[PDB]
Amino acid sequence: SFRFCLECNNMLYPKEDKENQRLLYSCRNCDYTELAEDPKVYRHELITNIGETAGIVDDIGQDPTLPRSDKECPECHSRDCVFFQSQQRRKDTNMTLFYVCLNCKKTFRDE
Amino acid sequence: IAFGFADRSLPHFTKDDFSPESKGFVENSYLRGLTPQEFFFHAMAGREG
Amino acid sequence: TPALTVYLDREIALDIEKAKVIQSSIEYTTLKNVTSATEIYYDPDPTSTVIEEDFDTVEAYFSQSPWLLRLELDRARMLDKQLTM
Amino acid sequence: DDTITTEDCWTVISAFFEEKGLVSQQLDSFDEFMETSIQDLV
Amino acid sequence: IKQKLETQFTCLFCNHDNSVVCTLDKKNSIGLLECKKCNLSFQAPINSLSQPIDIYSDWIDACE
Amino acid sequence: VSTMRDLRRSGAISPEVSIIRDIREREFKIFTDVGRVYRPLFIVEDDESKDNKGELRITKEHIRKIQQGYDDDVYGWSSLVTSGVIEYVDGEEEETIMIAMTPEDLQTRSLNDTAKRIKPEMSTSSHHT
Amino acid sequence: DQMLKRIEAHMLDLIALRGIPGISKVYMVKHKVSVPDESGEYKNEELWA
Amino acid sequence: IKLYGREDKGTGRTIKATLPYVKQDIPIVIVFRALGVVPDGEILQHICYDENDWQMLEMLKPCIEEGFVIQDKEVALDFIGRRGSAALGIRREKRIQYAKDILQKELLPHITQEEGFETRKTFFLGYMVNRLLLCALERKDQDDRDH
Amino acid sequence: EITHAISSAKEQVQEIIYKAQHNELELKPGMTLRESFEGEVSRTLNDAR
Numbered sequence: 001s002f003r004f005c006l007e008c009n010n011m012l013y014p015k016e017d018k019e020n021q022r023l024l025y026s027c028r029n030c031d032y033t034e035l036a037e038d039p040k041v042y043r044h045e046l047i048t049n050i051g052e053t054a055g056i057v058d059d060i061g062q063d064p065t066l067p068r069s070d071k072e073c074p075e076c077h078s079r080d081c082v083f084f085q086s087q088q089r090r091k092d093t094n095m096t097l098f099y100v101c102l103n104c105k106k107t108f109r110d111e
Numbered sequence: 112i113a114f115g116f117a118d119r120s121l122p123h124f125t126k127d128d129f130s131p132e133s134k135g136f137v138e139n140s141y142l143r144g145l146t147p148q149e150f151f152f153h154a155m156a157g158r159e160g
Numbered sequence: 161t162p163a164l165t166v167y168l169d170r171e172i173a174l175d176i177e178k179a180k181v182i183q184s185s186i187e188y189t190t191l192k193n194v195t196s197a198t199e200i201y202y203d204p205d206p207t208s209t210v211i212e213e214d215f216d217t218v219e220a221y222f223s224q225s226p227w228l229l230r231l232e233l234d235r236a237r238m239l240d241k242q243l244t245m
Numbered sequence: 246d247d248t249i250t251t252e253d254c255w256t257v258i259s260a261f262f263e264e265k266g267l268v269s270q271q272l273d274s275f276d277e278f279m280e281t282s283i284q285d286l287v
Numbered sequence: 288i289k290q291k292l293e294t295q296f297t298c299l300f301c302n303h304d305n306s307v308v309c310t311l312d313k314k315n316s317i318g319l320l321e322c323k324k325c326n327l328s329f330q331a332p333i334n335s336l337s338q339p340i341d342i343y344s345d346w347i348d349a350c351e
Numbered sequence: 352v353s354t355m356r357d358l359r360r361s362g363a364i365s366p367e368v369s370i371i372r373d374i375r376e377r378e379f380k381i382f383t384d385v386g387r388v389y390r391p392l393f394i395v396e397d398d399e400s401k402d403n404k405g406e407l408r409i410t411k412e413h414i415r416k417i418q419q420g421y422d423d424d425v426y427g428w429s430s431l432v433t434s435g436v437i438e439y440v441d442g443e444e445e446e447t448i449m450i451a452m453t454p455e456d457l458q459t460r461s462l463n464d465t466a467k468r469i470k471p472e473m474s475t476s477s478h479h480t
Numbered sequence: 481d482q483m484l485k486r487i488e489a490h491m492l493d494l495i496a497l498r499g500i501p502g503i504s505k506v507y508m509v510k511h512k513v514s515v516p517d518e519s520g521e522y523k524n525e526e527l528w529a
Numbered sequence: 530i531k532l533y534g535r536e537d538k539g540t541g542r543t544i545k546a547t548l549p550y551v552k553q554d555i556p557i558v559i560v561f562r563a564l565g566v567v568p569d570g571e572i573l574q575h576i577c578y579d580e581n582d583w584q585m586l587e588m589l590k591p592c593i594e595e596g597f598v599i600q601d602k603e604v605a606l607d608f609i610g611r612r613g614s615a616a617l618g619i620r621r622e623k624r625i626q627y628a629k630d631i632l633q634k635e636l637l638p639h640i641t642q643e644e645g646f647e648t649r650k651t652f653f654l655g656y657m658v659n660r661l662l663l664c665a666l667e668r669k670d671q672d673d674r675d676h
Numbered sequence: 677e678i679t680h681a682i683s684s685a686k687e688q689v690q691e692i693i694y695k696a697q698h699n700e701l702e703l704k705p706g707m708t709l710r711e712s713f714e715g716e717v718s719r720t721l722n723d724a725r
């Protein structure tokens with residue numbers, strides 16, 4: 001995640017300081033320079049499994065269109081719960097369904 | 112039969128069902144008559160053909 | 161559907177492990193396959209690193225531009241390709 | 246009150262038909278056109 | 288790579304249309320303009336987002 | 352959304368007005384456009400607070416009143432619609448709802464005739480709304 | 481900084497560990513083939529390919 | 530709108546817009562700046578709403594990088610007015626105003642046609658581009674045109 | 677008999693579903709878990725009919 005300058009509102013561009021040989025966070029339309037906590041500059045992944053458990057909405061318990069289920073709820077121990085599958089459109093999506101309860105809203109896998 | 116509606120082929124079925132009938136299996140025959148869902152799946156196939 | 165009908169050698173044609181070896185050698189492979197995750201670091205120290213995911217590994221391994229080009233590979237996929245990192 | 250039979254639905258349909266008719270939407274849009282469209286465009 | 292542009296732009300001095308030649312030179316981020324009739328030239332910094340139309344706009348903003 | 356649903360159900364808002372809430376997308380779209388299409392639907396009362404829960408709002412009283420065609424203190428189709436027993440649905444509205452493909456199907460059922468079509472099992476979800 | 485990411489992206493693709501290029505995948509296929517037999521008749525023969 | 534740049538090809542994953550009565554595409558940041566929000570912080574706010582989505586941030590990053598030359602509404606506008614498909618010789622005097630006109634008029638007229646609600650246009654544009662980026666990530670289904 | 681066969685086939689399909697959903701259904705060559713699932717289901721239905 002990349003952030004901007006608080007007062008200049010322009011993007012912080014991390015420029016090296018060879019004299020101290022450290023990482024910084026330097027804007028360009030201003031001169032506000034701040035130290036970089038982690039020497040990481042940019043990070044990118046190849047295999048993505050993020051967003052499968054981050055696409056959660058609270059009011060999902062109020063939808064009747066979704067099927068109900070007697071799948072025992074790990075937390076609320078109810079026997080009337082809905083279940084669905086990840087929203088990811090990747091061709092290789094593995095359909096280990098994200099069973100969701102009326103209350104817990106937890107993406108639990110009982111496998 | 113695909114999910115022409117969001118996450119389901121028909122509003123009369125729940126979301127995320129996969130039973131044979133739930134995605135376009137006909138169990139009846141013409142003599143037995145066709146329930147509306149299987150009728151519609153057959154109609155889709157015929158239009159396609 | 162571009163494809164090739166390939167006939168192996170007589171001994172291989174009746175053999176399976178040799179056939180798999182020949183397939184693996186033939187099937188095209190790249191780092192992207194075995195590559196898993198990449199992480200660009202400004203590692204100021206040419207002689208060491210300030211990231212612990214490899215700190216001990218570099219210490220036992222170590223015994224210019226300071227910016228670090230660090231990446232991760234996929235062991236499961238790496239061995240799927242009959243190769244080691 | 247009791248369960249709703251099928252002929253209940255058929256008479257439902259008959260009443261709906263008698264109100265609206267087959268050309269209902271046709272006359273509706275034609276009337277709304279003559280009513281509001283002309284002045285709005287003018 | 289230099290790109291001579293014998294454009295259709297009309298220059299204000301000799302008032303001849305298609306007399307403006309907008310040769311863009313991004314090497315130094317510095318533009319170049321030429322006329323084949325009165326030989327007037329214009330200068331303006333050129334970012335990665337400047338075009339002969341933008342150059343002509345800068346010329347009008349500068350001369351007049 | 353419940354409030355506006357009931358608002359249109361009374362007839363306060365035009366039935367043609369389409370009201371769609373997207374739970375997953377955290378979106379709420381309302382349409383009142385010309386050129387939209389719609390078809391009627393029975394309203395299965397689904398509130399978990401009364402007997403009509405999972406049951407039709409329409410009743411044989413409305414049937415009698417229509418057979419009269421008058422109101423027993425004109426009682427027409429639009430009267431049924433306005434009373435809140437009958438709603439339309441456009442193509443997009445059809446998606447976010449669960450309909451009972453037959454009046455029988457509203458009540459969860461409990462035979463073996465070779466001269467008839469076959470109804471669905473409907474067992475994957477022990478609960479229906 | 482930008483040079484480092486350019487190098488990262490450049491290497492991400494331009495390193496082929498093994499295999500003939502242009503071959504996304506290969507399949508281990510078995511094959512039956514009629515084979516003349518020593519006595520003179522023909523014998524089919526399951527064989528990898 | 531269109532997601533310029535291919536996956537690690539075409540340089541960054543940039544985006545440029547297509548407009549009525551124009552002849553060229555423009556970086557999306559530029560049209561944001563000509564509409565009032567020159568800073569990229571407001572642009573990202575109106576566009577990205579889950580800052581945790583660093584992936585969104587880095588797909589838009591080339592768009593942000595390329596959006597540093599324009600820093601105010603007038604340069605963004607004359608820039609835009611330079612590509613307004615109009616005649617030759619409008620000069621910055623009227624070019625900026627014509628650009629602002631086409632930013633207001635001919636642009637999302639169904640949203641607003643008067644002044645003072647270009648902020649509404651910015652918010653709606655940010656939402657639309659957010660949908661575009663979600664689709665590029667393909668975390669959601671492409672809107673079935675047959676629906 | 678037809679109904680018993682249909683019940684058995686639908687049971688096969690349901691067991692295939694329980695198989696795939698618990699991340700237990702084997703992958704077909706060059707054909708995804710979703711695509712393998714679809715193929716197995718289709719084969720089961722063809723066998724049933």
Ligand SMILES: [Zn+2]
Nearest residue numbers: 005008027030
């Ligand atoms: Zn700044």
Ligand SMILES: [Zn+2]
Nearest residue numbers: 073076101102
């Ligand atoms: Zn629960």
Ligand SMILES: [Zn+2]
Nearest residue numbers: 298301322325
């Ligand atoms: Zn001249």
